[PDB]
């Protein structure tokens, strides 16, 4: 990485119901071929890596989902900081998760 | 005796104290040890399960209480509800194979 | 009064692809509470109190859940104890009203 | 504008620094977008466009990137909604809930 930054994505397609999670399986997988630390929870999925990298991802990740529907709504946000390193653990530390 | 499980999650954002906004934050989760929820906090944000007006509650209550010692505050509260499964963490973590 | 200005998005799982038709449903139930309503294109913006902007927001979510089996909503708020916000003076603010 | 995957997209860009107003840092991010070959539609709570995917990515990394410079942290989120059924248009969105 280069310019690091902590993130969380969310993927959904309309039109298929409520049962989804066949195709968030396949977003969460795509995540996992970059070189990026990957954390689901039941929410989403928190990615830390790479900027760049992970706009590829969150870029590839809704187009893969899109590519089995008709529509998809996909959200991305990015924490990054200056003062500190942009780490999954140094935000949990932080707020005393660990 | 009324249970509406949800699940959700929550991120409250101090505005105007520059980046160091954790120790706001922290005081913002400990609110929710005070419901009956499942509380599971991650790097972006802190997802709850258990009764829809109890998590508008906490969610009221967790803002709330960071704007007590800020100026400004954001917060986002998201829910996920369906009513042909139950609503739970387990649930959806199973169902993609995160459990 | 604890006046706050908010966006609330609804996405309805349904099987059709008119999702907008329940959506609408939802903004309808926004107007049946004292709050200025501001519908854009990916939300919308609402001003009032904090109470009724969460009341609004279960209501609007239950009626859509009425018509589809999954219904995932967010709501946004921004409050500000510094300066009275409304949506007129955060637009005049940035030069955007 | 011109593309090959238009999409309808929400942004904010939220500046933590000090004092409770960031309306200068917000109006520099909703400047940089308007330099992109992009529709902008500016609201109370966010910035809505309407454009080619990549050109929304582009300029939400750079209206994210231009605020950071000035401040020490950045929470900036970009939502999208892209369809192939129909065009992903603000004005077809608009009409399509009754506000126009």
Redesign the interface.
Known sequence: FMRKV???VSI?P????????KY??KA?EVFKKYDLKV??????T?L?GD?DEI?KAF?EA?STV?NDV???????????????ENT?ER??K????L
């Open positions: 902590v993130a969380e959904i309309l039109g298929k119901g409520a049962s989804v999670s968030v399986k969460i954390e689901t929870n039941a929410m989403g928190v830390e900027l706009l870029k809704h899109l008709d529509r998809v709504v996909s959200s991305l946000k990015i924490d990054e900081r200056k003062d500190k999954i935000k949990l932080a707020i005393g998760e």
